Each structure stands twice: as structure tokens, then as C-alpha cells.
Curated annotation (Swiss-Prot):
Inhibited by RC-(Rp,Sp)- and SC-(Rp,Sp)-1,2-dioctylcarbamoylglycero-3-O-p-nitrophenyl octylphosphonate. Also inhibited by diethyl-p-nitrophenylphosphate (E600). InterPro entries: AB_hydrolase_1, AB_hydrolase_fold. The lineage of its organism: Bacteria, Pseudomonadati, Pseudomonadota, Betaproteobacteria, Burkholderiales. Catalyzes the hydrolysis of triacylglycerol. It shows a preference for triacylglycerols with a chain length between 6 and 12 carbons. It comes from Burkholderia cepacia. This is Triacylglycerol lipase.
Amino acid sequence: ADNYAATRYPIILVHGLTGTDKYAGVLEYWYGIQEDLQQRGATVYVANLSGFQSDDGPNGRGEQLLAYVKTVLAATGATKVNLVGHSQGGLTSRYVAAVAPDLVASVTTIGTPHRGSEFADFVQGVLAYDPTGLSSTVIAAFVNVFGILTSSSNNTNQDALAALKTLTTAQAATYNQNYPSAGLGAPGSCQTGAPTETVGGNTHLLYSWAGTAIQPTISVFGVTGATDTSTIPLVDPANALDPSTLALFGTGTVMVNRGSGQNDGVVSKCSALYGQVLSTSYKWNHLDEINQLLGVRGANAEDPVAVIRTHANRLKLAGV
Ligand SMILES: *[P@@](=O)(CCCCCCCC)OC[C@@H](COC(=O)NCCCCCCCC)OC(=O)NCCCCCCCC
Ligand SMILES: [Ca+2]
């Protein structure tokens, strides 16, 4: 009905871990997001990359995105695009910004583990306690096969062990060295960087935000316990019609006990921080961020469809 989200450059929504554009070709990762933006006069494109893989490397997700960004420009007549990444997606959008500045006009990250995930360190530490190392073989085989069965194009390019390593606190620290951005502040500071970036003479408008439903609220005998601020305590229906609200609150407790502090379930506040931080106050878990698990969210959670809508308006008034 409107031209509210009518940006100058086309929007490309980049998925994260486990993702694709539509699971099994039916479940949209960005639930009703592309549609909502379309109605409001925006040109939106949703990337289909590997659900399980690293961002760098010839056969990585970054190159899959560059290739896709290229075809979009070839299909739109555009010169640059607006990368909007979620989770590993923001880490993937960054790669294209770095390696191909001219084709990128802005990078926006939604709950992106720029410094990594403490939960990725955990899951890997749990894999290492198998002295034989067969858990890593069989669980990766399993998770890769999920990638293929739920990818809309049944993409065989899945490396689960690469995807889990890419997301660890220590490996992301190497990523940032190898792919520096002006929107990144010093490692270990829980501080962001500059709002814009300039590579090869090309200006990118850097933005980001975070979900912080899981806050640490009680420390007893060393053991830290958290609260899911997205929900009305106990009686909230989101804990019923959404298995991820409670799953993320479980992963979110493992996080606080590993020093993450306030997090969205799998990403910390400190790790999500990039460029221009518009908010970290959202009472959202990791999926609420993408209006995920059939449009369901707790009662104290803001409308994520509205947030990505006000942002596309912000990109428009920004000149991108
Ligand atoms: P980001 O890319 C990476 C965040 C860092 C996390 C590392 C986990 C280590 C392997 O985000 C991508 C995903 C995150 O998905 C989740 O964490 N889901 C919670 C798993 C939870 C379980 C805890 C049980 C605890 C007792 O964002 C999503 O994939 N989104 C989509 C919903 C997809 C539903 C698909 C159904 C397919 C039948
Ligand atoms: Ca949810």
C-alpha cells in the first residue's frame, strides 16, 4: 500500500545457521518479513545459501552470497545492495562488504555473533569429551543431512563441524582479524565501532541490533540462573505454541553460566554489537528476531516485523 520501505538499493535478507530461504521449501526463515517489506514498496530478495558451513573459504557461504548479490544486480539493474543479515548471516554479509565493497551499500546485523557464541564453545567442548571422536563424525553427518533435507534446493554443500567452529568465541576472533570492519570495536570491550565504513572508496552504512530476552537474574552457589524477559512469567502462551521460546531459554542459561551475560539464547549482547547499534533492549530471543516459529513471540516482545520495517525506512532516509 505504501512506499515506506522503498529503499534505493535492493534488500537482501541473509540467513544464519541451519537456514535457507524456506525450510523444505515451505517454512520461511524470515517469516512474513519479505512480504511485509514488499507491500510497503520495497524490492526484497532472500538468499539461499548453505545452512551449515563457514563464511570464508572457496566453498563457503560468503562466496555463495557474492554470487547471489551479483545475479540480483543483474536482475534489478542496480549497482549496490542492502545486506540485512541475521545470526551467521551478518558474518556473511560482512564478507561480501569486505571482498566486494562496490556492490554493497549497507550491512545490517540482527543478533550476529561477531565475537562468537559461548554456546558454540560449549557444544564443541561436549564433542571433545568423546575420546574416540565418533560423536563428531556421526552428529555432523546427521546435521549435514538435515541441511540437505531442509534446504529448498537440497544443497549438498554442508559442513556442520565448520559451521560450529566458525561460531566459537576463539574462531570468530580470527575471522575479525582476517576481515576487519570499522563497525567493530576492540576485542573484549563490549563496545561497537563506527556507524559507517569506507572500503576502496565505497561508503557502507553499518547498523545492528540485539535480542536480550535472557538476562542473568539470580546467582546462588556459583550457578547463575536467568529469566526470559520476553514472556509473562510462567502463564505466557509463547511457551506453548513455540518450542523455541523455552529451548532458547535453556541454551540461554548455558550462556550466562559461561560469562555471556544478557543474550538472546545463543548470541550475547557484546557479540551482537556492530556499527550503529539501534537497540539491544528488545525482549527477544534468537528467533523472535526473525518473527520466527510461525509469528509467535512473548507478550513483552516488540513486533520484529515492525522493527525491520522502520529500518528499511531508515535506510531510505539514509540515501541507501
Ligand atoms: P545463528 O546463525 C548462529 C548463532 C550461534 C549458535 C550456535 C549453536 C551451535 C551449533 O542463528 C541461526 C539459527 C539458530 O537456531 C538455534 O539455536 N535453535 C535453538 C536450538 C535449540 C535447542 C536447545 C534444547 C535445549 C535443552 O536461527 C534459526 O535457525 N532459525 C529457524 C527456525 C527453524 C525451524 C526449522 C524447523 C525445520 C523442521
Ligand atoms: Ca518465538
